[PDB]
Amino acid sequence: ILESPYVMMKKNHEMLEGNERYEGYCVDLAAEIAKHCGFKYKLTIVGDGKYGARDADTKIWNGMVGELVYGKADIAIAPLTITLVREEVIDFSKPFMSLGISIMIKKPQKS
Amino acid sequence: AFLTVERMVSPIESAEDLSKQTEIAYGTLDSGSTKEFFRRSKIAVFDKMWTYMRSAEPSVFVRTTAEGVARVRKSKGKYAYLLESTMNEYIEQRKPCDTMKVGGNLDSKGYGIATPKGSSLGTPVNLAVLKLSEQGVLDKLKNKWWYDKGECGAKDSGSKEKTSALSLSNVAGVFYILVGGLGLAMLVALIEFCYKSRAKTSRRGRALLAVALNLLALLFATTAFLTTYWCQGTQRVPFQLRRFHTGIWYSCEEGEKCRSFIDLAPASEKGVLWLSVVSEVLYILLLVVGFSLMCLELLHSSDGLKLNAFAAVFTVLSGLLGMVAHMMYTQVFQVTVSLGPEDWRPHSWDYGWSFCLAWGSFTCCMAASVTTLNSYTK
Amino acid sequence: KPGVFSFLDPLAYEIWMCIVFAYIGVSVVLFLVSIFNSLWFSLGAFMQQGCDISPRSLSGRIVGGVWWFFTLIIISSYTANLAAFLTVERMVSPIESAEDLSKQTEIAYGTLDSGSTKEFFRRSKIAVFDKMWTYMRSAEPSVFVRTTAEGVARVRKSKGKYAYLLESTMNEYIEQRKPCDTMKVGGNLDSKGYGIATPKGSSLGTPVNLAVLKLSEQGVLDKLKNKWWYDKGECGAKDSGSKEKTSALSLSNVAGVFYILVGGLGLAMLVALIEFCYK
Amino acid sequence: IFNSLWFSLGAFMQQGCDISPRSLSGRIVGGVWWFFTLIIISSYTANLAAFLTVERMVSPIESAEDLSKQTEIAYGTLDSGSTKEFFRRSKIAVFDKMWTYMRSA
Amino acid sequence: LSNVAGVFYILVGGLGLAMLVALIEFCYK
Numbered sequence: 001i002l003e004s005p006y007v008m009m010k011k012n013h014e015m016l017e018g019n020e021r022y023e024g025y026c027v028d029l030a031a032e033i034a035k036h037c038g039f040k041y042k043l044t045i046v047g048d049g050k051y052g053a054r055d056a057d058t059k060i061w062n063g064m065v066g067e068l069v070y071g072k073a074d075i076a077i078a079p080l081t082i083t084l085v086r087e088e089v090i091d092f093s094k095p096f097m098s099l100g101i102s103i104m105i106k107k108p109q110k111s
Numbered sequence: 112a113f114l115t116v117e118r119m120v121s122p123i124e125s126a127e128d129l130s131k132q133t134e135i136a137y138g139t140l141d142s143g144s145t146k147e148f149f150r151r152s153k154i155a156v157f158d159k160m161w162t163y164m165r166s167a168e169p170s171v172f173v174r175t176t177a178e179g180v181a182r183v184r185k186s187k188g189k190y191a192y193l194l195e196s197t198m199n200e201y202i203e204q205r206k207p208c209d210t211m212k213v214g215g216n217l218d219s220k221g222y223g224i225a226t227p228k229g230s231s232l233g234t235p236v237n238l239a240v241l242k243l244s245e246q247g248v249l250d251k252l253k254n255k256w257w258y259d260k261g262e263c264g265a266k267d268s269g270s271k272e273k274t275s276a277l278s279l280s281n282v283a284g285v286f287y288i289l290v291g292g293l294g295l296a297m298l299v300a301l302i303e304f305c306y307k308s309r310a311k312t313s314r315r316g317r318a319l320l321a322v323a324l325n326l327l328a329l330l331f332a333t334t335a336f337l338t339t340y341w342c343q344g345t346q347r348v349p350f351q352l353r354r355f356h357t358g359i360w361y362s363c364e365e366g367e368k369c370r371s372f373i374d375l376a377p378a379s380e381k382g383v384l385w386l387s388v389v390s391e392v393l394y395i396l397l398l399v400v401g402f403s404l405m406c407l408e409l410l411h412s413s414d415g416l417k418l419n420a421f422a423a424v425f426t427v428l429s430g431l432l433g434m435v436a437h438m439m440y441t442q443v444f445q446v447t448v449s450l451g452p453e454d455w456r457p458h459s460w461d462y463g464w465s466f467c468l469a470w471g472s473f474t475c476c477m478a479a480s481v482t483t484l485n486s487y488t489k
Numbered sequence: 490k491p492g493v494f495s496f497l498d499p500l501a502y503e504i505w506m507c508i509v510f511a512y513i514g515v516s517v518v519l520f521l522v523s524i525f526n527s528l529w530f531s532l533g534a535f536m537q538q539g540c541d542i543s544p545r546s547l548s549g550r551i552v553g554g555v556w557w558f559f560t561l562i563i564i565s566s567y568t569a570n571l572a573a574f575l576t577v578e579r580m581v582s583p584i585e586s587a588e589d590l591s592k593q594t595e596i597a598y599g600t601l602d603s604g605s606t607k608e609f610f611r612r613s614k615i616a617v618f619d620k621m622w623t624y625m626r627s628a629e630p631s632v633f634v635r636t637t638a639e640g641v642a643r644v645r646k647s648k649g650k651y652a653y654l655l656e657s658t659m660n661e662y663i664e665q666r667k668p669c670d671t672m673k674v675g676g677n678l679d680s681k682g683y684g685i686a687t688p689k690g691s692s693l694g695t696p697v698n699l700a701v702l703k704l705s706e707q708g709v710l711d712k713l714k715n716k717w718w719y720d721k722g723e724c725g726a727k728d729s730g731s732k733e734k735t736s737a738l739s740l741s742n743v744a745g746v747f748y749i750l751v752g753g754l755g756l757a758m759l760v761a762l763i764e765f766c767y768k
Numbered sequence: 769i770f771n772s773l774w775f776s777l778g779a780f781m782q783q784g785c786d787i788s789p790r791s792l793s794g795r796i797v798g799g800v801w802w803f804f805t806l807i808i809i810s811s812y813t814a815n816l817a818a819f820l821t822v823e824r825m826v827s828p829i830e831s832a833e834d835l836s837k838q839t840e841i842a843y844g845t846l847d848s849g850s851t852k853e854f855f856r857r858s859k860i861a862v863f864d865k866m867w868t869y870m871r872s873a
Numbered sequence: 874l875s876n877v878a879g880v881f882y883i884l885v886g887g888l889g890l891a892m893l894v895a896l897i898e899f900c901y902k
């Protein structure tokens with residue numbers, strides 16, 4: 001999914017092609033897995049813009065998980081939060097980035 | 112009392128402060144796992160925060176994340192926002208950089224590489240995560256994509272001085288009256304070098320000016336006797352907008368309209384207002400006593416200074432009762448704002464325009480006095 | 490420990506210079522009334538001690554009034570700021586990040602003499618962590634302690650000028666244990682995770698892995714973290730954070746004015762003896 | 769020695785004295801001790817202001833939640849009885865923390 | 874301002890009491 005600073009567009013993405021058009025934190029990670037596991041890769045943006053939630057009515061995964069479960073996608077290198085119900089259908093690796101809910105407030109003003 | 116309470120206030124760090132305070136609001140996105148987290152959490156701090164946010168009117172829940180960015184920025188620190196810490200790093204790097212991340216994480220969540228279940232790639236990719244995290248190349252890219260991409264500093268976050276002392280800029284508004292009093296005095300010294308150098312019209316022409324300043328002192332007395340509007344009384348509700356333009360006695364409201372609304376509550380304040388009318392009338396009457404004795408000087412210009420010495424008594428006793436009367440009304444007008452003036456309170460609370468004028472009536476009563484005792488020296 | 494420069498706290502160092510700069514700009518004006526004499530008559534208008542030259546009703550009365558009005562403002566403001574320091578008393582920590590330890594050298598810092606943490610700085614390629622390891626391999630005497638409790642006591646005995654690097658969850662717990670004279674500052678230097686391990690290929694491995702994502706989802710782990718770090722913690726933080734109700738003035742604060750007291754006297758004794766030779 | 773003993777009281781705190789050693793070394797001697805004494809007294813004001821405020825800042829405790837909040841004033845029950853048993857049994861976190869304190873007291 | 878206002882009545886009241894003193898001492902002379 002196009003998220004800063006994980007997957008971003010180039011200023012000259014029209015001057016680039018394919019995987020070159022994309023940039024960010026997860027984009028450099030995609031090079032390192034290819035350096036580790038030896039494969040060519042295709043960075044694809046998710047169509048619906050969803051992270052891969054589950055429906056409650058159809059119980060159909062949308063998003064990246066629906067691209068992973070239904071054979072549309074080969075792998076995901078993306079800010080995907082590891083939950084219980086997501087591991088029920090696919091397999092995460094170990095987490096590369098621990099995080100949590102944080103408090104954004106204003107900075108103390110210089111007046 | 113200022114500098115202590117200013118230093119007594121601690122910035123909030125933990126979310127337990129948000130369960131403790133209520134002045135700074137706080138919210139999450141209107142849909143997502145983060146809002147779901149407080150909805151689900153059983154910890155009493157997180158439950159109380161969710162109890163607040165479900166009772167938060169107006170709604171702290173924003174629709175986009177950038178809406179939560181701007182709503183913190185526009186509310187000026189009295190609205191907080193809860194978001195993902197790695198994104199909270201990056202937005203703090205993005206300019207204007209007027210927000211910041213405080214405290215630790217509220218929970219533990221992890222981004223991890225996902226494969227379809229049963230794929231052959233899943234195991235060496237999982238080993239690749241434990242390789243790159245071991246070598247810190249992820250942290251090197253975290254330094255890249257948050258701090259080599261960060262607009263506001265990489266280490267400049269630690270450049271904000273923590274609890275330092277009183278600023279020089281606190282003492283800069285008195286510098287312009289310091290230097291400005293010096294340059295105004297240099298005009299006085301150079302002209303008095305020419306007043307020593309260029310040299311019945313002395314005692315008479317200054318005494319007629321003392322009569323002339325009392326004539327202006329009479330007119331600004333009558334000017335604030337009916338103020339055009341004492342305050343722009345604003346109750347601009349985004350109901351609808353309200354613009355009271357209330358005089359000193361008649362409370363006009365404004366399409367054009369005017370009413371009296373004289374003599375509000377309370378009764379002890381009424382006896383102050385009945386005493387306020389006394390100091391208004393004794394101000395103007397002792398002017399007229401001061402006019403009549405100076406018209407005897409006009410007959411002396413056609414006793415003398417002995418009655419002008421008696422005339423200087425009542426003109427000072429005029430203006431001092433005006434200094435009573437100027438303090439009778441505005442203290443009461445401060446008292447009426449403490450009542451919450453029944454439907455006509457100002458939010459542009461600002462004295463208007465004849466009260467600055469009847470100020471100058473008093474100094475015309477006293478500038479008449481300083482020159483009529485100058486003629487008393489002879 | 491306060492002292493000389495610490496007396497000058499309630500008025501800032503730029504304000505100490507600008508109060509003396511605008512001081513001498515006033516005294517040149519009163520020389521035109523009667524530069525050489527009015528330098529002390531500006532000290533007559535410094536705070537108190539009403540001076541003898543009175544520029545009666547000319548412009549020097551205005552110059553003699555405004556600076557006199559200016560200085561009575563400050564000594565009120567200096568007293569009000571001093572009362573703020575003498576009542577609030579927020580003892581701030583000196584350092585937060587480990588980049589400060591790459592920046593300062595007065596407070597030492599170390600790890601255990603053997604372990605992955607010492608190995609981490611030995612391996613790290615980040616220049617801050619590399620400089621810290623460059624310091625610690627050059628640290629004489631050795632900052633590396635042999636047990637973790639030795640690293641606890643060496644911080645406690647060195648009185649703040651020795652820091653120590655350890656695991657943050659243990660750093661929570663030792664800060665809870667009395668005397669509680671140590672504390673944890675800053676965030677983590679890296680990301681490490683404790684995780685439940687099974688032998689490879691065991692049948693239990695998958696639902697146990699699902700059990701971790703269940704309990705972390707429900708915060709029962711955090712409830713036990715509240716249990717085993719804060720219901721087991723001896724020094725309750727906000728219960729211990731609100732404990733200071735102390736009292737009367739020190740003497741090192743006044744002692745910084747003694748050196749400008751005696752130093753102004755001995756400098757004046759040079760002036761009197763040479764003016765006995767200028768006569 | 770004979771006169772300036774009171775002119776040192778002229779430079780004691782206030783009351784600007786009549787002998788003025790105009791611009792010689794006595795102007796420096798008359799200035800520094802005068803500068804010295806205004807220090808003591810401004811700090812004496814701020815110390816006393818730090819006294820009476822904090823004296824009035826301290827509220828007497830009224831609830832037992834204060835005893836779960838403070839630790840300077842100790843608190844206990846009888847060594848045997850239903851009252852001690854009450855804190856031993858109570859599930860409210862304020863009363864539980866008080867019992868946690870008193871078993872660790 | 875009400876805190877200061879209690880000192881205004883002893884301000885102005887000290888002035889009007891003094892004006893009685895000055896006029897009678899003009900007759901004591």
Ligand SMILES: C[C@H]1CC[C@]2(OC1)O[C@H]1[C@H](O)[C@@H]3[C@H]4CC[C@@H]5C[C@H](O[C@H]6O[C@@H](CO)[C@H](O[C@H]7O[C@@H](CO)[C@H](O)[C@@H](O[C@H]8OC[C@H](O)[C@@H](O)[C@@H]8O)[C@@H]7O[C@H]7O[C@@H](CO)[C@H](O)[C@@H](O[C@H]8O[C@@H](CO)[C@H](O)[C@@H](O)[C@@H]8O)[C@@H]7O)[C@@H](O)[C@@H]6O)[C@@H](O)C[C@@]5(C)[C@@H]4CC[C@@]3(C)[C@@H]1[C@@H]2C
Pocket residue numbers: 069070071072227228229230231232
């Ligand atoms: C408009 C839409 C709306 C929604 C929708 O309607 C219209 O409904 C959706 C519906 O949901 C459809 C999906 C249903 C689920 C389907 C799953 C299917 O993959 C399945 O079968 C394998 C691929 O065919 C997968 O795994 C393969 O790829 C790797 C995954 O990591 C495996 O590792 C590899 O196994 C090994 O293969 C040999 C080598 O060792 C290695 O290459 C590899 O390690 C497998 O590749 C093949 O492996 C062979 C041996 O296993 C078999 O060919 C078969 O594996 C087993 O497959 C079993 C399936 O019954 C079979 O019984 C068994 O005998 C087979 O051995 C598999 O092909 C396996 O993970 C998975 O289960 C996928 O390709 C298509 C799929 C997503 C479908 C795509 C289209 C949809 C989404 C439909 C469509 C969107």
Ligand SMILES: O=c1[nH]c2cc(C(F)(F)F)c(N3CCOCC3)cc2n(CP(=O)(O)O)c1=O
Pocket residue numbers: 003051079080081082140142143144145176194195198
């Ligand atoms: O797996 C998930 N990964 C996510 C990753 C990110 C980002 F930070 F951009 F990487 C975000 N954003 C932060 C704020 O909301 C807008 C975008 C949301 C994510 N959500 C949605 P949740 O349900 O609210 O957690 C997921 O589900």
Ligand SMILES: O=c1[nH]c2cc(C(F)(F)F)c(N3CCOCC3)cc2n(CP(=O)(O)O)c1=O
Pocket residue numbers: 603604605606607637655656659
């Ligand atoms: O898997 C490991 N788990 C560990 C867990 C802990 C503890 F915190 F006690 F749980 C500690 N300590 C840190 C505090 O002082 C006492 C020992 C060391 C650990 N080590 C050794 P490393 O090689 O230095 O990392 C491991 O290897």
Ligand SMILES: O=c1[nH]c2cc(C(F)(F)F)c(N3CCOCC3)cc2n(CP(=O)(O)O)c1=O
Pocket residue numbers: 846848849850851
């Ligand atoms: O029924 C009971 N009635 C009680 C009545 C009283 C008194 F106040 F004297 F009336 C007291 N005291 C108060 C303190 O202890 C000494 C005497 C104890 C009582 N107890 C004992 P408990 O188990 O500590 O409650 C009971 O059981």
